[PDB]
């Protein structure tokens, strides 16, 4: 399970880079005014590629830095909301949501980190959990409302974006709670790694699909 975790970091590294280059190369098949979300999606995969290389080396060396994961999340999670907003909004409405959802996502990861760097089951741990969980629910409710008014092919394409996040992100708070119910540290690293590949590359592909639909594809 220590070796497995290392192999998975290497598979994630290669998966994230594959997603980055796929999304950059596919960006040309979409019209310029719909490319923003695809570019941001590739940036998310590229940041994760860089971090998974660091997590792999950090793991190998011993003294694994559990903070690398949170540095990756605090950058990529706000950007993942932004890449969705890039295909649902434009102009002032987009900039408003980028700031508001972006700060909320940053607070969620920050509260999580506050709790993570505490003794498990401690007061600090539960404070982090509750603030992050409240912000998570607020963001998922914002995402649900973002679909209202969409029609036909864009409604279907957004439903897929929305449901990948709604279903795919549940593992993160579940992993956080795990250690209070028992000893789950090793499995949590493995599941988070698999989750990050699916969530980051998957969301980029679905945002690309939305931009394709918006481009008349």
Instruction: Decide: 59 and 82 in contact? Cβ < 8 Å.
Output: no
Token pair 């540290």: residue: 185
Q: Cα(209)–Cα(75) distance, rounded to whole angstroms?
A: 23
62 Cβ neighbours under 8 A, 6+ residues apart: none
Structure tokens at 28: 């040309």
SS3 130: helix
Dihedral angle over CA of 173, 175, 179, 180, nearest 10: 30
For 112, half-sphere exposure in the C-beta direction (CA atoms, 13 angstrom radius) is 26
CA 207/CA 112 separation, integer angstroms: 27
* Spatial distance between the Cα atoms of 78 and 104, rounded to a whole number of angstroms: 8
Q: How many CB atoms lie within 10 A of CB 131?
A: 17
Residue 107 CA to residue 99 CA, distance in Å, equals 12
Sorted by where each begins, the domain ranges of the chain are: 3-216
195 and 171 Cβ atoms separated by less than 8 Å: yes
How many Å apart are CA 16 and CA 44, to the nearest integer? 9
Which residues lie below 8 Å from residue 2, measured CB to CB, with a gap of 6+? 59, 186
Given phi > 0 = left and psi -120 to 50 = alpha, else beta, which region is 88?
Answer: alpha
SS3 label, residue 22 = helix
Domain 3-216 CATH (choose: 3.40.30.10, 2.60.40.10, 1.20.1070.10, 1.20.1250.20): 1.20.1070.10
Resolution reading in Å: 1.7
Compute CA distances 109 → 62, 76, 186, whole Å.
25, 10, 21
Alpha carbon distance 200, 75 (integer Å): 12
**Rounded distance between C-alpha atoms, residue 48 and residue 197, angstroms:** 9
Structure method: X-ray
Quickly list DSSP for 67-123.
HHHHHHHHHHHHHHHHHHHHHH--HHHHHHHHHHHHHHHHHHHHHHHHHHTS-TTSH
């Amino acid at each position: 399970m220590e070796e497995l975790t290392y192999r998975l970091f290497m598979v994630a590294t290669v998966g994230m880079l594959a997603g980055t280059v796929f999304l950059l190369a596919s960006s040309r098949e979409v019209k310029p005014e719909h490319r923003r979300g695809v570019y941001i999606s590739a940036l998310v995969c590229g940041i994760a590629w860089y971090h998974y290389q660091k997590m792999g080396a950090s793991w190998e060396s011993g003294s694994y830095d559990t903070g690398l994961r949170y540095v990756d999340w605090v950058l990529t999670v706000p950007l993942m909301f932004v890449e969705v907003l890039a295909v649902t909004r434009k102009g002032a409405a987009y900039n408003e949501a980028v700031r508001n959802w972006g700060i909320a996502a940053t607070v969620m990861i920050g509260a999580g980190y506050y709790g993570e760097t505490s003794a498990a089951g401690s007061n600090e741990y539960w404070t982090g959990f509750v603030i992050a969980m409240a912000t998570y629910v607020w963001l998922m409710r914002n995402l649900q409302a973002e679909g209202e008014g969409l029609k036909g092919d864009q409604a279907v394409a957004f439903e897929n974006i929305k449901n990948l996040i709604l279903v795919g992100w549940i593992i993160y708070p579940l992993g956080y709670i795990a250690p209070v119910v028992g000893d789950f540290d090793a499995i949590r690293e493995v599941l988070y790694t698999i989750a990050d590949i699916i969530n980051k590359v998957g969301l980029g592909v679905l945002v690309l699909q939305m931009a394709r639909v918006q481009s008349g594809e």
